[PDB]
Scaffold this active site. Structure first.
Site, short mmCIF file in Angstrom:
data_model
loop_
_atom_site.label_atom_id
_atom_site.label_comp_id
_atom_site.label_asym_id
_atom_site.label_seq_id
_atom_site.Cartn_x
_atom_site.Cartn_y
_atom_site.Cartn_z
N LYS A 17 -60.25 -4.66 14.56
CA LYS A 17 -60.56 -3.45 14.24
C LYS A 17 -61.38 -2.67 15.41
CE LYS A 17 -62.59 -1.66 9.93
NZ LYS A 17 -63.22 -1.94 8.78
N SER B 121 -61.44 -0.16 4.35
CA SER B 121 -61.58 0.28 5.95
C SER B 121 -60.66 -0.15 7.16
CB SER B 121 -62.84 0.58 6.30
OG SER B 121 -63.51 -0.71 6.78
N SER C 207 -63.49 -3.59 2.32
CA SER C 207 -62.73 -3.11 3.55
C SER C 207 -61.96 -4.08 4.11
CB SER C 207 -63.59 -2.48 4.57
OG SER C 207 -64.51 -1.56 3.83
#
Lengths: 551, 551, 551
Positions: free
Chosen positions: A149, A224, A248
């Protein structure tokens, strides 16, 4: 950190992405056939971060047609099986890198899940890993690339979590978990997209545009860790690392039909990640892997924990990663929280999974009732943004617009005085204690505790854009910090999943989600996932039960 | 303060102008082609201040033909974009100065909009700014020149507001707002014309002659900030500072098709400007920007307020310049006060924006009725010249003639006894209080206030000379001290803007304005502007709604 | 206006007071023991408005002795804490009303601080507040009664500001601030006394007689809000509303050893109050609370402003009531203006407060010098009565005698011509601008501005009657419109506060105040208060610093 106008800054982000896309294409070395098919794909990347392009109807179908067998024969292979080939030298580390880079480029165009490719360092990692084959073949993750990420620090990169104002926040270090994984033969090769503020179950930012679902280009990837869910749903990465403070990790994994583990806080290092509200400790995010492959999720966990990360990160507990030996299991089914009912596809998955467990002799299956789920929104409503969202709003001094999803997350945020935080910390700890007593009320007369609960991740399959207005099915487990593993079950079936007729909504929000499910055709080919919930530090129980559910 | 014969004084005023015109041409360094074509342009400057010349029919068309691309490539660029070039060193501050100085010279001749050039100090400011480029490019207005109304004090200059008798009133200081703008990287480069007494919605004085509109040379520029409206309508300045006590900023902006903000009293420093009736506080003037660029209007407001001007001028409130996060808007349409109806070009403009706002889902649009607009004339008739116009009439001891428009403003002026002023102050505050309740009467049942009202600036497009016989469409909001933003909508269309058929006038003054509009052909190509009205200190809502109206 | 004989009108005023006193006693429902002790108290009320009675030496001691524990347990409790008891139902709204009504009756007789009790409407307010407990318990001031200066309009009452000629001036509405407080759970229960012309720092009128100090009955209560100072000094009201144009809130608060806030003009509504010179705007009065409790002053300010009063009164600014975030403070000590030196008790208070601030690490303490304090009198001497006191003097057509203190305020008043008013408005705004420059000259090398100045409220503790012949220590901040908070420090100490020997007066007026302080025994038990001064709209900084000084 920056206050330049956002329009120029979005330019610089696109340039960083575009320069790395160029280098990635150079590394992948497309032949004439692939360059042509890649050239002709519908793109989810626009010319600017406000143009969301025109995504394919079924990006995974387009991905499988476009890529050559020489690539898919590697990227479609289960990574644990692929690790055998790297160990026996049937394939080189550089060959594996070239294949997955090609895969991630195609996924990037179809899904818009990559923020930055890492082809320079990725080639350097793989070459020296090939050179050191004899001394490092023994490493548990030898030769395997993975995605990270964008919020995860990597040397020489900006760490922004999607905020344009932080484009000058360059770090000279990797996150602890990245270094541990590198010490075990793996290396990151791509940084995946994340949205503004990180507090949306979708993936839209002014650094990358919009990320879409791998199975249906009209639906969101989730968030997310939207890029991670999307990239790994396309099987364009062996695994990825996300973060999870409100769903997320599990929401992207469920929306894209793969596995995702919200691991128990204190097992694997996550604190050196970057987010908003740095220093806020009232509610803590955790990390964990996302992957198409359950065996790979388990192996990443086993690899990181067996490296004793509590000797680097003192927030962690020296609790070994150990397979449970249980032969019998007690499992609860969480059909609804009775605030927002699940849509037909989620409801069918619960029945499928119920019948499969009942058909095995060693599972006792009970209904699991909710416990004050309304209190989740109340407490998290005060603790997610305990500074009244001042830290996040300061990122918009660039003029960066406020996205609709970000608004839901910061609406009503109070700037808490110390006594206000104390009041809600006590509410938080009280609820945690109350919920544990609720869980233990399901213990049987012989003293066998509930081993796990099976629940939805979301009231529906992958949401339509700008509709993720209910979090409790994931955020329940952030308030409690229970480990949760999202896992695949079924796909939308248009005959079986027609809307309920003569439905009477439970409240205005349940009405909204009922009307959101206009027909299964709006969510064609969308995976219906569920999740396994366990008590704190029983992560491995969830892996073992998920193993049985897929066999 | 001066009693010499006015014809000599007008002479020195012309000479001060003429010497600065030279010096301006020397700095601008024209090329024979322009320097020639400039010589051959039709002039609005006569041989003396009573000779009004023969202006071009469309000065802007002549302006755009006359100047070189090396100039227009700078002056036509939106100033915020030009600030990017000024920041990145793609253009030097002196380079921009030469371009706009050239532009102002062509505009000076075509519209008669320049009272005195500042080419010596503008080069003096600009040269040290291209030097410390590396130290002040961070400043929000680095390198951008601007125009100032003549009434605004600048070091070493006379401050006359058009009255010849004050030609020896020399100041050794700048206005607070000027110093603040200089501290933020800007500098004034030209002083714009202002009329006699400042109390006319046109621009005629015995210091400069007559100033005309940038789009049609047969009509007035507006006033009292007529030069600012002309110079910025001709696109010869990035922005300017005007004053507005009866419409004196919005009328120039509306007549010349640009943006002009009458900001709420107490936000931006204005008291050190010069006018008649110094010390009169019953009705106070305010300042604000005129520009063709809405973003430039917004940036100046933000720039000055973020400099904390209440730490120099204690009249000001520490209220941050904050863009609203509002998601819905309720907006009223002020079609007419039912004393003087607007002409067809204004009436069609109202339909244009009404239908544009109705086509957007997030705007609720209601009709806005007037509230005792006749009381505006009654109260302002007593408080505008509360000394019976004695202070102004004393300026004419030089023999300076009383202009026809000035006559209207001083007719009926009473020399108020203290008790008379007290009576009308109470009339003023009660009307303000009554009107607020009227505004709040449009709040809906859910408690959402009216965000703004859309109204005309004038009963017509740019007026014919000596025809500004109605003030209420601007002076209403001076009595109330509401912020008002004039903004562009359309231009006269000869097919659509024919006179109303078999019309029935409302009263003698309404008959006058109907007969003034003989055919659209007399107002060919004249911008038809409207305005946004907000409650006190809601200036920023007005900017945001104007942004949406232009997309 | 009335023109009946003043002796008859004084009768009508006394009757109105006495009729409400009878009703107040009925509501309080004394047992015979209290009725007896009340009956035998020395009264500051005479048989007529020129007979000033025989006040107690220590009225507060007599008040605390006379009242039963059943009343004092409520009235002596800090009002914010009492709000908890009303919210949790440990006490009823009617119970609180009875206690405070009884307290005010005892206060009325000892200090003569009540013009009219409001027992009928107050019982109606309190009863339905009890009936609506479930719906109104959430209100920030639920159940709390409060006092209002007589000048504040209340439904069905005459509003006279002490002038007998206005006894027929009946209003059918409350002042805006009263309605706002009622909307927030509060209600007025008593109207406090105000002196003739309101331009006195004492409290003598022909509507009520003479009001005396709560701590020493030979001294003045102060003025113009003298009843409020006496009533709240006796803790016979939770808080009160006064007005302040020359010290009329802070002088009563300081003389009676409590808190009083002269709030910045434009935060809270006061214009609908009644005074002399209605319509005069050159110098404007403000309102604000007086209370024993700083927490109550803060809560009243917070309550009214969070009701957004600028949507009813358009002179007000939409500036939130916000706790300051500063943890460090720069504070100046204003020991003297070098025109009239403070008496020993005030000088000891300055030293005490200086020493306490220096002992805390986060305070830097500097000496604050005056800036043209003589200019305060010159300007206010022209602007206080700008009609030559014609409006006030006309009130005496009834034959109402002119009081000695009123004489001082109207001596020399000019009936200004418009040009004279303009001249002095310019003198006013220039002095304001100069003083801001003076204040900012104390900013340090690091750019930290002065947060507050500590100064006297008056050259002495509570003055002897008819000796308040110097205003500058309070009126300076009315000319500047700076927020000022009076706060308690100490009481006179006969050992520490002996007169200075070998004092050499600065002038005749300083000589007057020196000889006025004959010995501390003349001021037994008199509170020595100071005030905190801040720049405009920094009201909250003053509350925060006073908070630190009391901990």
């Amino acid at each position: 950190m920056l206050t330049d106008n956002w329009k120029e800054l979005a330019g610089k982000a696109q340039s960083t992405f575009q320069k790395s896309l160029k280098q990635a294409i150079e590394l992948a070395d497309f032949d004439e056939g692939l360059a042509k098919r890649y050239g002709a794909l519908p793109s989810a990347i626009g010319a600017n971060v406000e143009d969301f392009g025109s995504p394919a109807q079924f990006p995974l179908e387009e991905y499988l047609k476009a890529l050559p067998k020489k690539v898919l024969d590697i990227t479609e292979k289960d990574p644990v099986e692929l690790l055998k080939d790297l160990k026996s030298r049937k394939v080189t580390c550089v060959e594996v890198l070239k294949a997955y880079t090609a895969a991630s480029i195609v996924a990037s165009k179809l899904t818009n899940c990559v923020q930055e490719f890492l082809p320079i360092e990725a080639l350097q990692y793989a070459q020296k890993l090939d050179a050191d084959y004899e001394t490092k073949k023994h490493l548990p993750l030898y030769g395997l690339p993975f995605s990270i990420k964008e919020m995860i620090p990597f040397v020489g990169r900006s760490v922004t979590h999607g905020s344009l104002c932080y484009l000058d926040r360059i770090v000279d270090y990797n996150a602890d978990i990245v270094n541990i994984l590198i010490a075990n033969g793996a290396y990151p090769f791509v940084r995946t997209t994340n949205p503004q503020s990180l507090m949306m179950l979708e993936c839209v930012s002014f650094s990358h545009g919009r990320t879409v679902n791998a199975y249906n280009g009209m639906l969101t990837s989730g968030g997310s860790s939207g890029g991670e869910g999307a990239l790994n749903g396309m099987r364009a990465s062996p695994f990825g690392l996300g973060s999870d403070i409100g769903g997320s990790i599990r929401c992207p994994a469920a929306f894209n039909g793969i596995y995702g583990l919200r691991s128990t806080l204190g097992r694997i290092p996550t604190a050196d990640y970057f987010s908003c509200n740095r220093g806020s400790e009232s509610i803590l995010s955790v990390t964990g892997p996302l992957s198409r492959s359950l065996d790979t999720v388990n192996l990443v966990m086993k690899t990181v924990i067996e490296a004793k990360p509590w000797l680097i990160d003192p927030t962690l507990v020296p609790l070994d990663w150990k397979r449970p030996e249980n032969k019998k299991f007690r499992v609860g089914i969480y059909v609804s929280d009775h605030i927002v009912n699940p849509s037909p596809p989620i409801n069918r998955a619960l029945s499928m999974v119920t019948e499969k467990l009942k058909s095995l002799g060693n599972f006792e299956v009970v209904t699991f009732e909710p416990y004050k789920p309304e209190k989740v929104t109340e407490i998290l409503g005060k603790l997610y943004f305990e500074d009244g969202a001042r830290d996040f709003r300061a990122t918009l001094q660039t003029g960066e617009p406020l996205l609709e999803q970000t608004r839901w997350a910061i609406e009503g945020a109070e700037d808490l005085d110390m006594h206000d935080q104390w009041y809600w910390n006590l509410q938080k700890q009280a609820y945690r204690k109350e919920f544990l007593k609720h869980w233990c009320s399901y213990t049987d007369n012989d003293g066998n505790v509930l081993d796990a609960v099976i629940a939805p991740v979301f009231p529906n399959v992958a949401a339509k854009h700008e509709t993720t207005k209910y979090w409790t099915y994931t955020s329940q487990w952030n308030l409690l910090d229970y480990p949760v593993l999202a896992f695949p079950v079924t796909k939308v079936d248009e005959s079986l999943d027609q809307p309920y007729k003569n439905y009477k909504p439970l409240n205005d929000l349940d009405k909204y989600f009922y009307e959101q499910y206009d027909s299964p055709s709006s969510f064609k080919n969308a995976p219906a996932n569920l999740c396994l919930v366990g008590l704190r530090f029983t992560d491995e129980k969830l892996v073992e039960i998920a193993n049985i559910l897929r066999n």
